[PDB]
């Protein structure tokens, strides 16, 4: 764990920060709950088994903030690409991923690194 | 609590000022007590869970007033969104929830305090310029 990585002089990343697998749980759980209450977002994922992407999202946000475990899901491109997309819609659930950490007590400016981290993501997701 | 946030050196809030928490709920349940008994707001609640209402009125007045818990429900400019809420409408509300500041005993300095944080919510909130 963590003890184990300090001990090998490892830097503390963000999914370390934030509290790691059991934060990215609770903030994975919260996103989709405010992404599916969201009715410019929801029927995005009318056809989408739920469980299995909040699974998917828990690995691909904990291995994409520094965390040990893998992620096991589709390549972000190739998942996104074709599905009307746009800025509008990823500039939204960028925004429910705040404030999905802002409920989870995480200060500002760690929201702020995570959203430099997914901002970049854009090109894969978008299309509009 | 207040005595362990001063002990790490946390500063007093307009939470801490208003009576935390315990104060926050007291002012909730009458300022929604105004809001639906005012015939130009009650119909924008017809079919709201006023309950859950309340409590996510709560956790916001207590975040945004500086209080240590975060707040956890949908933001304003979205969640009022699609419902032509108007700059009147906004005043309104806004005059109530200073009158159950009142009611409650809060200083008026510390309700124009309260208002400050308030108005600038006008923007996220209405959609439509009349004040009539
Ligand atoms: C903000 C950055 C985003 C990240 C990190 C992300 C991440 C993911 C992940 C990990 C999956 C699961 C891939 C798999 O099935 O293997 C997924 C699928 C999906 N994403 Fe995103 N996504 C993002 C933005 C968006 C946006 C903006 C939308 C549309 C508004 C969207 C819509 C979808 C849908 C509908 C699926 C499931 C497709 C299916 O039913 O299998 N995503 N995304
Ligand atoms: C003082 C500024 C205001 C604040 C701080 C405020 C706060 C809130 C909060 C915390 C919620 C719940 C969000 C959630 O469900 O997560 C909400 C929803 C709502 N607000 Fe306001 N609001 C304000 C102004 C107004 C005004 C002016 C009106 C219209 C007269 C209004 C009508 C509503 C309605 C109809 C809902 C949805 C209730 C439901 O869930 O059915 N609000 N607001
Ligand atoms: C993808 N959410
Ligand atoms: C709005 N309450
Ligand atoms: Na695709």
Redesign the interface.
């Known amino acids: 764990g963590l003890l184990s990585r300090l001990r090998k002089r490892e830097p503390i990343s963000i999914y370390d920060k934030i509290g790691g697998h059991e934060a990215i749980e609770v903030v994975v759980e919260?996103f989709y709950v405010?992404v599916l209450?969201?009715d410019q977002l929801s029927a995005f994922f009318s056809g989408t088994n739920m469980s299995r992407l909040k699974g998917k999202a828990v690995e691909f946000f904990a291995a994409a903030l520094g965390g040990p475990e893998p992620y096991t899901g589709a390549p972000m491109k190739q998942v996104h690409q074709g599905r009307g997309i746009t800025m509008h819609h990823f500039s939204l659930v960028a925004?429910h991923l705040a404030?999905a950490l802002?409920?989870?007590?995480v200060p500002s400016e760690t929201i702020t690194e995570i959203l430099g981290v997914i901002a970049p993501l854009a090109v894969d997701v978008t299309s509009g």
């Open positions: 919260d405010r209450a969201d925004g404030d802002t409920a989870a007590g």
